[PDB]
Amino acid sequence: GTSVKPIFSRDMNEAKRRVRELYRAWYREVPNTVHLFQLDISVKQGRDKVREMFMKNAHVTDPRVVDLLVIKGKMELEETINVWKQRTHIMRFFHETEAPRPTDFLSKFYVGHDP
Amino acid sequence: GVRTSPTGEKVTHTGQAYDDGDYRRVRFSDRQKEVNENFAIDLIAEQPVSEVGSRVISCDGGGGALGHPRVYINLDKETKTGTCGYCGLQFRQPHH
Amino acid sequence: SRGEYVVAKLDDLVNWARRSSLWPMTFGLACCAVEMMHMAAPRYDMDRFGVVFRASPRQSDVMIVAGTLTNKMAPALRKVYDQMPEPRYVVSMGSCANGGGYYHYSYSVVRGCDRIVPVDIYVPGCPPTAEALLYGILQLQRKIKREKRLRIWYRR
Amino acid sequence: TYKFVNMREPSMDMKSVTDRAAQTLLWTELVRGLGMTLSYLFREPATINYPFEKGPLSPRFRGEHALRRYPSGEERCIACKLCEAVCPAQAITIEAEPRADGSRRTTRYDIDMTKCIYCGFCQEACPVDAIVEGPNFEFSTETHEELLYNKEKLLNNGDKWEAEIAANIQADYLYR
Amino acid sequence: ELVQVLRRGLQQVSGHGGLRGYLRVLFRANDVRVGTLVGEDKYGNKYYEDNKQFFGRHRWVIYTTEMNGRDTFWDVDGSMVPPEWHRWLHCMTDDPPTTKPPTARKYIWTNHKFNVSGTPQQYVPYSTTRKKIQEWVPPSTPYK
Amino acid sequence: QLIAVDEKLDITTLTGVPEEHIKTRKVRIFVPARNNMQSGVNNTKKWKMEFDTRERWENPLMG
Amino acid sequence: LHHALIPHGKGGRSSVSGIVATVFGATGFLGRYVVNHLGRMGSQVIVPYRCEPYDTMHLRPMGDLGQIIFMEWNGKDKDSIRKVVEHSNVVINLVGREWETKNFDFEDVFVKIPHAIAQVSKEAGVEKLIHISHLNADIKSPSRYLRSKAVGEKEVRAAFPEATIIKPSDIFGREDRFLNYFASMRWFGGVPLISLGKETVKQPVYIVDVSKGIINAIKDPDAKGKTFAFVGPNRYLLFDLVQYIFAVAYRPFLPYPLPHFAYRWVGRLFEVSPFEPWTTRDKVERVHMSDMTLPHLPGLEDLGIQATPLELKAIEVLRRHRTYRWLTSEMEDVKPAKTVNI
Amino acid sequence: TRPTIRPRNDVVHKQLSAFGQYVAEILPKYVQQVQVSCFNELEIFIHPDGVIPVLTFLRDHTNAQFKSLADLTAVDVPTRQNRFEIVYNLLSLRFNSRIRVKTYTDELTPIESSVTVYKAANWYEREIWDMFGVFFANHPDLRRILTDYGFEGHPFRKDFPLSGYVELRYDDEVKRVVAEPVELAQEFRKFDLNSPWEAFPAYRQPPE
Ligand SMILES: CCCCCCCCCCCCCCCCC[C@@H](O)O[C@H](CO[C@H](O)CCCCCCCCCCCCCCC)COP(=O)(O)OCC[N+](C)(C)C
Ligand SMILES: NC(=O)C1=CN([C@@H]2O[C@H](COP(=O)(O)OP(=O)(O)OC[C@H]3O[C@@H](n4cnc5c(N)ncnc54)[C@H](OP(=O)(O)O)[C@@H]3O)[C@@H](O)[C@H]2O)C=CC1
Ligand SMILES: COC1=C(OC)C(=O)C(CC=C(C)C)=C(C)C1=O
Ligand code: SF4
Ligand code: SF4
Ligand code: SF4
Numbered sequence A: 001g002t003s004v005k006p007i008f009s010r011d012m013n014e015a016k017r018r019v020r021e022l023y024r025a026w027y028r029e030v031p032n033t034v035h036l037f038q039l040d041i042s043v044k045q046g047r048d049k050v051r052e053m054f055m056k057n058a059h060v061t062d063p064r065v066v067d068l069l070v071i072k073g074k075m076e077l078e079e080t081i082n083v084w085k086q087r088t089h090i091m092r093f094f095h096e097t098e099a100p101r102p103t104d105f106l107s108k109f110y111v112g113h114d115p
Numbered sequence B: 001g002v003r004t005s006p007t008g009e010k011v012t013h014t015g016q017a018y019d020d021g022d023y024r025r026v027r028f029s030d031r032q033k034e035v036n037e038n039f040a041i042d043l044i045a046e047q048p049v050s051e052v053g054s055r056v057i058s059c060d061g062g063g064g065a066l067g068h069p070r071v072y073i074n075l076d077k078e079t080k081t082g083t084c085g086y087c088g089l090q091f092r093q094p095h096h
Numbered sequence C: 001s002r003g004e005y006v007v008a009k010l011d012d013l014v015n016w017a018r019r020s021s022l023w024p025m026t027f028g029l030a031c032c033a034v035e036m037m038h039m040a041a042p043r044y045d046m047d048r049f050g051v052v053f054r055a056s057p058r059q060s061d062v063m064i065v066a067g068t069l070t071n072k073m074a075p076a077l078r079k080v081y082d083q084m085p086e087p088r089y090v091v092s093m094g095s096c097a098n099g100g101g102y103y104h105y106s107y108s109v110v111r112g113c114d115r116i117v118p119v120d121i122y123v124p125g126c127p128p129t130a131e132a133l134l135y136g137i138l139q140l141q142r143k144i145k146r147e148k149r150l151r152i153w154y155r156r
Numbered sequence D: 001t002y003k004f005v006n007m008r009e010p011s012m013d014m015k016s017v018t019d020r021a022a023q024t025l026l027w028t029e030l031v032r033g034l035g036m037t038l039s040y041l042f043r044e045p046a047t048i049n050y051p052f053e054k055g056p057l058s059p060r061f062r063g064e065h066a067l068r069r070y071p072s073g074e075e076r077c078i079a080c081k082l083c084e085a086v087c088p089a090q091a092i093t094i095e096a097e098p099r100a101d102g103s104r105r106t107t108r109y110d111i112d113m114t115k116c117i118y119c120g121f122c123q124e125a126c127p128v129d130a131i132v133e134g135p136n137f138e139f140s141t142e143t144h145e146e147l148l149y150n151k152e153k154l155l156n157n158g159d160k161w162e163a164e165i166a167a168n169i170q171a172d173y174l175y176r
Numbered sequence E: 001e002l003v004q005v006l007r008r009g010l011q012q013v014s015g016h017g018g019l020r021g022y023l024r025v026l027f028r029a030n031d032v033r034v035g036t037l038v039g040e041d042k043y044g045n046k047y048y049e050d051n052k053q054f055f056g057r058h059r060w061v062i063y064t065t066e067m068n069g070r071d072t073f074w075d076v077d078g079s080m081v082p083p084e085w086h087r088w089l090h091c092m093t094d095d096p097p098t099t100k101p102p103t104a105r106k107y108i109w110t111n112h113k114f115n116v117s118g119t120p121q122q123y124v125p126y127s128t129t130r131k132k133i134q135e136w137v138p139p140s141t142p143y144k
Numbered sequence F: 001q002l003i004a005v006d007e008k009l010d011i012t013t014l015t016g017v018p019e020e021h022i023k024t025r026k027v028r029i030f031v032p033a034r035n036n037m038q039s040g041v042n043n044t045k046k047w048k049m050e051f052d053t054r055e056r057w058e059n060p061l062m063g
Numbered sequence G: 001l002h003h004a005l006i007p008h009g010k011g012g013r014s015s016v017s018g019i020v021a022t023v024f025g026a027t028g029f030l031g032r033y034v035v036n037h038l039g040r041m042g043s044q045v046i047v048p049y050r051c052e053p054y055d056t057m058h059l060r061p062m063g064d065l066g067q068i069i070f071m072e073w074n075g076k077d078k079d080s081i082r083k084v085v086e087h088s089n090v091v092i093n094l095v096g097r098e099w100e101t102k103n104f105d106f107e108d109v110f111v112k113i114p115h116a117i118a119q120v121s122k123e124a125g126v127e128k129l130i131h132i133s134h135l136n137a138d139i140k141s142p143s144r145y146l147r148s149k150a151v152g153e154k155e156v157r158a159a160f161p162e163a164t165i166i167k168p169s170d171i172f173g174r175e176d177r178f179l180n181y182f183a184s185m186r187w188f189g190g191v192p193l194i195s196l197g198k199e200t201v202k203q204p205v206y207i208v209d210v211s212k213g214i215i216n217a218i219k220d221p222d223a224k225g226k227t228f229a230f231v232g233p234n235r236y237l238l239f240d241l242v243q244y245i246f247a248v249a250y251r252p253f254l255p256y257p258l259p260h261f262a263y264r265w266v267g268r269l270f271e272v273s274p275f276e277p278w279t280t281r282d283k284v285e286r287v288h289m290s291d292m293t294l295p296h297l298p299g300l301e302d303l304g305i306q307a308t309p310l311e312l313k314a315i316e317v318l319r320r321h322r323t324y325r326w327l328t329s330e331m332e333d334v335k336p337a338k339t340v341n342i
Numbered sequence H: 001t002r003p004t005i006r007p008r009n010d011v012v013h014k015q016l017s018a019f020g021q022y023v024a025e026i027l028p029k030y031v032q033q034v035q036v037s038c039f040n041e042l043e044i045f046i047h048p049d050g051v052i053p054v055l056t057f058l059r060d061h062t063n064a065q066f067k068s069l070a071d072l073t074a075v076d077v078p079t080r081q082n083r084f085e086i087v088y089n090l091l092s093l094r095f096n097s098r099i100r101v102k103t104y105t106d107e108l109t110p111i112e113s114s115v116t117v118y119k120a121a122n123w124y125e126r127e128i129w130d131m132f133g134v135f136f137a138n139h140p141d142l143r144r145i146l147t148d149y150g151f152e153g154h155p156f157r158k159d160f161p162l163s164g165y166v167e168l169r170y171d172d173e174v175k176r177v178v179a180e181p182v183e184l185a186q187e188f189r190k191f192d193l194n195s196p197w198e199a200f201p202a203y204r205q206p207p208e
C-alpha cells in the first residue's frame, strides 16, 4: 500500500493527461513569445526547445513527481505569458555563451582532472 | 632593507620577486610595485640587549595595556639571550 | 600650431561644462541610498556643486549604484544604463556594489556591478559616509577634467 | 495609557462658523505655510564648505585599515589569525611561517576592501593592537583592483597614518 | 545696522590682503570669511578657526597651490591634509598639532602623499608569497 | 483517499541540481575520526556526508 | 611551459587559459569580439589603445579582476610596441582603417604598422602571431586598400615567418560597415548600384565565426605558418543581397544603375569630410568587386567552425533599421534570397 | 545567581501549561504533543491533517482568540523522514499571549493552505514554497516570491549550496545578461569550530 496521498492525479494516466494539456498550452504560446519578446530564433526552434525540455524528464514514473513537474511548468508558462520574464530569461534556455563541454574520455583527460 | 633583483624589481620583506620568465610582471608596466621600505627584521635587530639582575624578567611590549600580553622570560642559559615571543626584544644577565 | 590650441581650448570648455553640470539618476538600491540622500541633505548640499537628481534616464548623466545588486535586479540596472544618452558615467558606491560585500557568497547576488556595467569610480565603505561619496563625485569631476576627445580626434 | 489624535469637534456658533468661512475663502492656513517658508529663507543655512570644511568625527570612527608597529619598528602582528577567524565577511586572508630569525610573522596579509563591511571586529579581536581601522575615509579608486590590499599596502598605510592612529587609540583605550 | 554689515564686508575685503587676495580666495574656495591662523603645514596648507561660527564651519583649511608634484591651484581634495592636521580638522581633538605635536617615530612617513589613484604611482596588487611546488630540473647532459 | 504508489523515491528532477553534479559525484557517509590533538570525543557522535574533492587552483590576481 | 602558464579550472571567467595575448586594434568592430572570447575563458588580455579611454570602457566587463590591462601605445613608436608585447605569448593584429586620415594613409596602417608589430614581436620572443588580411588582397587591385593589404601581408610574412594570416570577406554584424552601410542608403531615396549590382558576387561571413576562428587558430598547433580564408556558406549577387537587406528591414527598395565614373565622383565628394566619411572612392571600388575564390587555402571548417548563414543572423542587425510598424516581425517571414552557388 | 542570570516567571509557566492541557483535551484527534519551554513559550505539535481545524479553533474560540498570524515559516532537518517542519506563530491580543503550532511534511506531500483562516498567510506560504519546495493545496495564487524568474532549486534546503549553481554577467556578443555555472576567484573557506568537549550536560543524549 505504502499509504501515500496524491497532489492532483491518482495514477499515471491522469498525470499524462495533465502533461499533454501543459504541452498544448506551451506549444500554442511559443509564437506569441517569439513575437512579444522580439527573439531572433524561429518558432520551430522554440517548439523544439519546449519538446526537449519536456523530454528531459520523460523517465519519471512517480505520479506525484509528474504532478509537481506540471505545476512548475504551469508556473513558468504564467511567467512567460504575463511578461514577468525578460528576454534574458527566455534565452537562458539555449545556453548561447557556454562553450561546448566534450564528453569522450580523451578530451576530458586532456583538459583537466574532472571525470 | 630592499635589494634589487636582476630584472630591477624590488624584493619585498617576505622575499617575493617575479622571475624573468613570469608574465605577471606586465601588471607593473606604466605603474609601480608597492614595497614597504622598513624591514622589521633589520629594525628589531638594531635594538640593544637589556641587562637585568634576575633569572626571570617580564615583558609587556611597553605602554601597559597598549602593548602585548604580559609574558615572563627565563634567562638561565648563559650563552644565549631571552627573546620576547611577541615584541622581539632581548634580555640577558650580566656575564664576564 | 593653431589647430592644436583651438582644439585644446574647446576640449577644456566642453569638459568644464560637462563636469559642472552632472545630473545623476534618481536610483538607489539599499542602505547606501540613505547616505546618498544625506549627501543631498542641507549639510552637504550636492546641488551647490551643480549635481541634481533627475528621474528619467534620458535626462541623466551619472548612475550611482548604491546598494546590493541581485540577480533578479541586474537586467533592470543594465536596461536603465543602456537608456542613458552618452556621455555617461557610472559610480560604484559601497561594498555590495563594489564586489558583493557581506553577500559576496550568496546564490542571488552579483559580485560587483562592474560585471554588468563599466565603472568609473569605486567608493569604499559599508556604507561610505556622505562626505566620502562627495569625495568620489569630485574625483569623477577631476577625471572628466582630464579627458582629451577633441585633441585625440585632431591627432587622428 | 493612550490618547486620541483626531477626535475633536468644531464649534457651531456664528463666530467660529464665519471664522472657518473666512479660512476657506481667504486661504489663511496657506498663508501660514508660506510664512514658515519665508521664515526659513532668512535663516543661516546648515551647509559646510567641503572640502575646505569637514564633518565632525570621533576617535572611535572606523576608516581605512592599517597595520601597526612597536616603537622599535618591529611589527605587532604575530599571525594568530583571530581577525581572520572573526571577520564576518571573510575578507582577510593570512599565511605565515617562521621568519629567518625565528619570529612568528606573516607572509601574506590581504584584506579585500570590496568584501569588508567595516564592522571593526578585527581590531577588537586583535590581542596586540596590530590591525586597526584608521581615520581615513577618502580613498576612492578608479579601478576595482586598487581596493584589494596586500601586506605591503597595509604596512604603508600604518606608517602613513600612525601619528593620528596612536593619538586616536590613546583617546579611547580606557573605554575598551 | 545695515552700514555695520557693509563695513564688515569691506573689512573682509581688506583682511584678505586687498582685492587680489580677496578674489583669489573667492575663486579658489568660494568663501571670503576671515579667520585666525592656527598654523601652517610644510606642504603649504594653512589652517584657520573662528569660534563664532556654528559647529562645522568654525574650522577650515586653505589648501596649498603646489603639493608633491601637481599644480593644485584649482584641483584640491581632502586627501591633501596630513594626518595630524587631519585629526585637528575633523574635530576628533581640540588641540592643534602646533600646541600638541604627535609622537616622533623612525618609521612614520616624513612626506605625506595624497590619493594617487589614476596616476602611475597607483597601487597594483600582487601575491606576496613564494612558490609552493618546485619542479624537477632534468639533467643537462646526454644519457647515451 | 490514497493512491498507493509502488515506485522508488526519486526527487532529482525537482531539486534543480545540474546533471553533472548528480551522476559524477560520490558522497562519503562516515563518522568523523577524533582529532588526535585532543582527548574530547564530542565530535564523533553524528554521521557526516560530504562530496568528493575537486580541483582548486591559484588565482592569477592575489594568489 | 612556465608553470604560471599551465591551464587550470573549467574554462570560465575565473579560470586560467594559459594565453597572454596582446590585441592591437581591440577598440574596433572585431576587437570587442576577440577580447570577449579571450576573456570568457580566463585569458590575460593586453589592450593597447590610442583613443580616449572613455572609448575603451565597454571592454572592461569582458574579463575577471586583473585579466584585462590597458596600456597606451603609438603606431609610429617602436618602444610602445616593445612595452606592450614584452610579456605576451600571442599577438593579434587587428589594426586598420577603412578611410585614409591626414596622418595615416593605407600604407601606414596596412604595411608600416603591421611590419613594425611583427618585427618587434619576433624580437621580443612572442611565439604566436595572428595577422588579419583581406580575401581580395591583390597586388594589382584597383583599390589601394587591397594593394596595401597584399604588401603588408608579404612584409609580415617576411618579418615573422611562423605567423598565421587570416583573410576574411565582408564581415557582417551588429556594428558592421557592411549590412549597416546598405541600410544607410535608404534616406536618400534610391540605391545607386554600378551595373545594377548584377555583375558582383559577395560571400559575407559572420563576425562570431571570425572571432571563434581566430581563437581556434591560437589553440591549434598545426596553424603556425598557415594562411586561412574565412568566407560564408553562400555566394550572393549584389542586387539580390541588397534586395534581401531591404526586405528584412521592410524598407522600399529603389535600385537604379549609376555609371562607374559618376559613382566615383560621388565618392570623392563624401571623402572631404573631416569626420568618418559616409563613403569613399575606395569603398565604392571594394563594394562593386567580386569576392575571390581561393579553394587552395584552408577555411573555417578546418578549425572546427560551421559558418553561420546570413539568413539566420540578418534580423539581429537589421531590426534596428525598421519602423515601429514592422519592429515585431519574426525572422522566418522575409523569404531568403537566391544564392549563385556552383 | 542574582545579577547575571535571567529571572524565571513561575506564574506564566503555570498558565501556559494549563492552556496547553486545555487545547490538547479539546482536540485529541490532531494533537500529538504539548510543550512549554523554560523561558515561557508554549508549543503544540499536531498531525498535518489538523492544520485547518486547529488554527480555526485557536482563532475563533472565545477562550483562545489568537486573531493574528505573527509568522509562518519552515525548518529543514534532512535526518528526518519528513524533511520539513512548518511553524505557525500566533499572538492573542485579548489575552496578551502567544502560541506556536508545529507540523511536518516531506517533499511530495502537500499541506493545506491556511489562507481561509488567515489573510496574512498568503505571502508566507508563497515564501515557503519558493525557499523549501513545500506545496500548499488550494492556494489562491502560488508562485515564486523571492527568487529570480526561472530560478531552479530551493535555496533554503540544507543540501543546496551556499553560492548556488549559476551566476550572472553581461555578455557583449549577445548584448544581454547571461547565466553561467558559478566559478569563484576565492572559494568560501569552511571552518570547523565545534569543540570536542561537551558544553551542556542537561541535553546529553543516551549512547544508543
Ligand atoms: C555664442 C553662443 C554659443 C557658445 C556659448 C559659450 C558660453 C561662454 C563660455 C563660458 C566660459 C566660462 C567657463 C570657465 C569657468 C571656469 C572657472 C575656473 O575655475 O576653471 C578652471 C580652469 O577652467 C578650465 O581649465 C578652462 C575653462 C574654459 C576653457 C577656455 C574658454 C573657451 C571660450 C570660447 C567660447 C566659444 C564657444 C564656441 C562657439 C562656437 C578650473 O577650475 P574648476 O575645476 O572649475 O573649480 C574647482 C572647484 N573649486 C574651485 C571649488 C576647488
Ligand atoms: N570589417 C571587415 O569587414 C573586414 C575587416 N578586416 C580587417 O579587420 C581589421 C579590423 O576590422 P574592424 O575592426 O572592422 O576595423 P575597425 O576600424 O572597426 O577597428 C579598427 C581598429 O584599428 C585601430 N586603428 C586604426 N588606425 C590606427 C592607427 N593609426 N594607430 C592605432 N590604432 C589604429 C582602431 O583603433 P581607434 O579606435 O583608436 O581607431 C580600431 O581599434 C582591419 O585590419 C580590417 O582590415 C578584413 C576583412 C574585412
Ligand atoms: C527633492 O529632490 C529630490 C528628489 O526628487 C523628488 C528625490 O527623489 C530624492 C531621493 C529620495 C526619494 C525618496 C527617492 C532626493 C534625496 C531629493 O533631494
Ligand atoms: S554596502 Fe553596506 S550599507 Fe551599502 S547597501 Fe551594502 S550592506 Fe547596505
Ligand atoms: S572591519 Fe569587519 S568586515 Fe572589515 S576586515 Fe575587519 S572584521 Fe572583516
Ligand atoms: S592582525 Fe592581530 S588578530 Fe590578525 S593575525 Fe595579526 S596579531 Fe592576530
Ligand SMILES: [Zn+2]
Pocket: B059, B060, B061, B068, B084, B085, B086, B087, B088, B089
Ligand atoms: Zn615583549
